[PDB]
Amino acid sequence: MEMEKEFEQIDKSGSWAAIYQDIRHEASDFPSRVAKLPKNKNRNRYRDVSPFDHSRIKLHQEDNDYINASLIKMEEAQRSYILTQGPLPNTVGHFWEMVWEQKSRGVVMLNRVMEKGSLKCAQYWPQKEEKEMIFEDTNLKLTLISEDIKSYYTVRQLELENLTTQETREILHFHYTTWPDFGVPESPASFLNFLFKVRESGSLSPEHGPVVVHCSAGIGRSGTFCLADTCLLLMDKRKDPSSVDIKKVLLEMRKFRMGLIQTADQLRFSYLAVIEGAKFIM
Ligand SMILES: CC(=O)N1C[C@H](Oc2ccccn2)[C@H]2C[C@@H]1CC[C@H]2O
């Protein structure tokens, strides 16, 4: 069955809610014992969103190695992603420590700092060249180098300095700024254009550490980004592009972080994204 006819039949049938609940029912359940330790309560944004112990990113410190972040490793596609929550006021230094230690080239942000009149993550990068940020708890300095503001996204060049060794690296910040406060975008054209801007940068390539991807919880919009990227890469690698099963790829990804794709509308949008992508990709 051709992906876009399961979708046209799910649409003809309006069964999106039924498909989505079948995924929720078959998803992996692994322990998250480190996330639930009392010493870590102020390191979690949402009580119901935690990294599994087996796939969690460890900070390189003896004090407390915990961050709300997971390694998604896709064996057949040969892609890895780190999915994390939007940083909290007390975890902005941990966030940049992780980017440093994992050798990431890119950070992908899919939310605004304020949405629906409430704060969805800390202001964790500098807004002016001449006002740099210092994270005293992790010994890092972060400077804004340049900013390119477009209609659907902004790309920033940042300089991260390890103050312990005086090594520096260039980090690219890819900020999708137009996801609506409610629901999903009507067309996937701008999100797809955005995905191909991150690829073109080198940030997803095996010469670097994994890309860091976040939204507010790091499971819904973040899940949509990695699911569309991996499905399109599998369609380019395999003999029969029609063999790629988006529901099976999503369940593989849910072995590494809980809750990826938060709504039936995010599942339909993911299908739409890979359909138009593949209409021009095979
Ligand atoms: C319809 C559309 O605009 N798309 C954008 C994108 O194509 C590229 C490739 C390289 C550089 C820029 N855009 C994606 C998804 C979809 C179709 C083909 C697929 O590669």
Swiss-Prot record:
Substrate binds at D181, C215, S216, A217, G218, I219, G220, R221, Q262. GO terms for biological process: actin cytoskeleton organization; cellular response to angiotensin; cellular response to fibroblast growth factor stimulus; cellular response to hypoxia; cellular response to nerve growth factor stimulus; cellular response to nitric oxide; cellular response to platelet-derived growth factor stimulus; cellular response to unfolded protein. There is a cross-link at C215-S216 (N,N-(cysteine-1,S-diyl)serine (Cys-Ser)). The modification Cysteine sulfenic acid (-SOH) is found at C215. GO terms for molecular function: cadherin binding; enzyme binding; ephrin receptor binding; insulin receptor binding; non-membrane spanning protein tyrosine phosphatase activity; protein kinase binding; protein phosphatase 2A binding; protein tyrosine phosphatase activity. It comes from the Eukaryota. The modification S-nitrosocysteine is found at C215. Keywords: Acetylation, Endoplasmic reticulum, Hydrolase, Membrane, Oxidation, Phosphoprotein, Protein phosphatase, S-nitrosylation. Changing S50 to A/D: No phosphorylation. It catalyses: O-phospho-L-tyrosyl-[protein] + H2O = L-tyrosyl-[protein] + phosphate. It is found in: Endoplasmic reticulum membrane. The active site is at C215 (phosphocysteine intermediate). Oxidized on Cys-215; the Cys-SOH formed in response to redox signaling reacts with the alpha-amido of the following residue to form a sulfenamide cross-link, triggering a conformational change that inhibits substrate binding and activity. The active site can be restored by reduction. The modification Phosphotyrosine is found at Y20, Y66. Coiled coil: none annotated. Residues 3-277 form the Tyrosine-protein phosphatase domain. One of its GO terms (cellular component) is early endosome. The modification Phosphoserine is found at S50, S242, S243. Expressed in keratinocytes (at protein level). The modification Cysteine persulfide is found at C215. Tyrosine-protein phosphatase which acts as a regulator of endoplasmic reticulum unfolded protein response. Mediates dephosphorylation of EIF2AK3/PERK; inactivating the protein kinase activity of EIF2AK3/PERK. May play an important role in CKII- and p60c-src-induced signal transduction cascades. May regulate the EFNA5-EPHA3 signaling pathway which modulates cell reorganization and cell-cell repulsion. May also regulate the hepatocyte growth factor receptor signaling pathway through dephosphorylation of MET. Belongs to the protein-tyrosine phosphatase family. Non-receptor class 1 subfamily. This is Tyrosine-protein phosphatase non-receptor type 1. It comes from Homo sapiens (Human). The chain holds residues 1 to 282 of 435 of the full protein.
